[model samples]
Target: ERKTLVLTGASRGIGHATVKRFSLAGWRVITCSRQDFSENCPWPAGPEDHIKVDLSDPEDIGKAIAEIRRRLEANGSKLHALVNNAGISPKAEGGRRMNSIETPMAVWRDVFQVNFMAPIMLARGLFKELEAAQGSVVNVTSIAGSRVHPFAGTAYATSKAALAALTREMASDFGPYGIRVNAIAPGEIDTAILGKTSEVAETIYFLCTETSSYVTGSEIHIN
Candidate 1:
């Protein structure tokens, strides 16, 4: 049976490449993004499916995940991995610098919703399925979340920082159930979210499957 992987932001950038990598490595990828795949994506290949969803809306996130699980169960499969790689925030150092003190609660809240809360919400929703499969979660964060990035701002950096902390908390909570949780804090990866940075998309593949067998509750910095 092909192991199942639930990935967000799979329509473009690192998410798109990760899906291809995992599928080539023999895993079935279930992906989602804000827009329909046909709009501008080259994936699905007729055998796979990519759903449209905006992670900014938490309720929609829940519904979309539930539907993915339903599809998996329909096919006698369990969720073996979850890659929370979807997130959004304004770029530019000016924005990051200004937001530290001037970033309103609304701005911070929205950023946190997508960057921080979405992981927790998505994890909570799919945990039972993951636990059943003895699976793992690989969240796509940034090194800006850990260290200061010259181009990134507070909303993007701090929100990811919070997510890294949350990653540790998740590892601690889900470790006993055989559900490993970890995060990759990449440094300016080559993704649409951050313009065109000359960096890799971190190491989500290893942490999602093979090389991460014993690396739970840890964050890998990719710079």
Candidate 2:
């Protein structure tokens, strides 16, 4: 059976690398991003498996779940992997840091909506399919989540911290159902969002494959 992966924010950066990694490995990829899939970058499954969703909007997130569910049903209602790679980091004018005291409440909320809440919502929405496949869930966290960084602001840091915590919590909660939940906290790499990304994406691929079946409730810090 060909495996299927539902990846969020897959238009570019690490998510983009992940899509290529899995597709090259023969898995069918269902990409979700704010924009429609662009033909400029070649990929498997074409645009048919792409879901246009704004992760910051609750309604749009719900719509994305339904669409993903519909697509999964057509292919036996099983999902082998889900990568919550969507995230947002807001910066003040001139790329200044938006620290805790100065960050706006609206910006704080928007950051969490995309970086934190959307992951769990999508996971819960696809719980059955994930369980059926005994899948793996990889939440793309950041080194900034654990420490202060030069560019990552308070909102982005706190949201990623929450996401890291969510990974540990979900691992325990979802383990019995045969799902593996883990995270990857990548340091500054060659690409933004950030990377050396082929290895990082390969780690995600490893977790999804049977090779890393014994690995769960773990977070790989890539630097």
Candidate 3:
């Protein structure tokens, strides 16, 4: 049977790597991002597989959820995996990290909406499809969430921490349904968003595959 994955923030970086890897593995990938699909990162499914949805906006996410369901139904496919890879880390002018006291409430909300809320919303909205497929959920967190980093802001860190916590909660709730949920806390990665030049796509792939069948509610930290 063919497998399917719904990946958020798949326009670039780790998300970009993941979509390419899964597609190469013969899985159909449906990606979503704030921007329109770019031909620069071509995949097997092409731009037709991409969805333009603003993760930070609940209404937009809702619409995207409906569209995703429609597409899956049309293909007669069940969702085998969901990767919550979309996030935002806002830095002030000159690349200064905003401390908790100095960070505005609006910034905090936006960070949470993208980093924490969107993941859970998508997971819950697609629960039926996942349960049907015994799907796996991989939540992309950051080491900065558990430790203070010079470049990560207060809002971003806290939001990621919450995401980690949600992973545990979802795992427990989804376990009986045979759906596994886990989180990955990656250190500095070499992406446009971060300056590190290392690869972490394989790690995420393991969690989404049968190799991780026994793993759930665990946070794998990639150093």
Candidate 4:
């Protein structure tokens, strides 16, 4: 049965591409972003629901999931998938070196909130629905999470590393319920992210629909 797909960070970049792939494949896609999306959003066609909301706020995340649940029920569908693709790299604000000892707590907090906490809360909040549908949750992480890097600063690297651990915990916690949890550690994809890069659209497509069936609680390196 075709089910609903909930994707975060669908406003642009890789998240935008994933939404398009799923929608074209006939899934009912529901997505969110921090900004008010243009009428012509990024998806190739369009999704069932696209809304403007800040994913870093726990309250906003809850509200978005609640609304998605409502929509799924109305459509006689269940939540079949969730892509935790919304995140923040230090580059979001130009990633300047502010002296490791002198960096503001706010900067680190911002990175952690968006890169780690938001995805954790999103998956935790929607876990029940996912289990009911026997669906999958894919966290769009980065290769930086798996290895330390001179290119990435402390904030981006640490946050993503934490998220990888969170993915493992969720996988173990939710497996008995028939829910699968996995992560994609993307290389420099053809998004806004920098460094050694290529178009990760096909890679993202594989994680969401193809390579995920027997996988859970593990991170796939797409670089």
Q: TM-score of each candidate?
A: 0.86, 0.94, 0.92, 0.84
* lDDT value, residue 103 of candidate 1: 68
lDDT (10s digit) by residue, model 3, range 91-123: 776778788888887898898999899999999
Q: Which has the higher lDDT value, candidate number 1 or candidate number 4?
A: 1
lDDT (tens digit, per residue) of candidate 2 on 1-223: 7789999877456877898899888888998878877777567577778899999999999998988988888778999999998888888878787899989999999999999999999999999999999999999888888888877889988999999999999999999999999998875622353247777888888888998887888999986
Off by over 4 Å in 4: 44-48, 91-99, 148-151, 189-199
Clashes of each: 2, 0, 2, 0
Error of 1 at 78 (Å): 0.8
Best by lDDT: 2
Residues 72-131, candidate 4: write the lDDT tens digits.
775454678888777665543455533355556887888788888887787777776777
Q: Clashes in candidate 1: how many?
A: 2
Cα error, candidate 1, residue 84 (Å): 1.0
Prediction 1 TM-score vs. true: 0.86
Error of 2 at 4 (Å): 0.4
Error of 2 at 131 (Å): 0.7
Instruction: Give lDDT: candidate 1, residue 188.
Output: 65
lDDT against the true structure, per candidate, is: 0.74, 0.86, 0.83, 0.70
Rank by TM-score, highest first: 2, 3, 1, 4
Model 2 clashing residue pairs (backbone): none
The candidate, 2 or 3, that scores higher on TM-score is 2
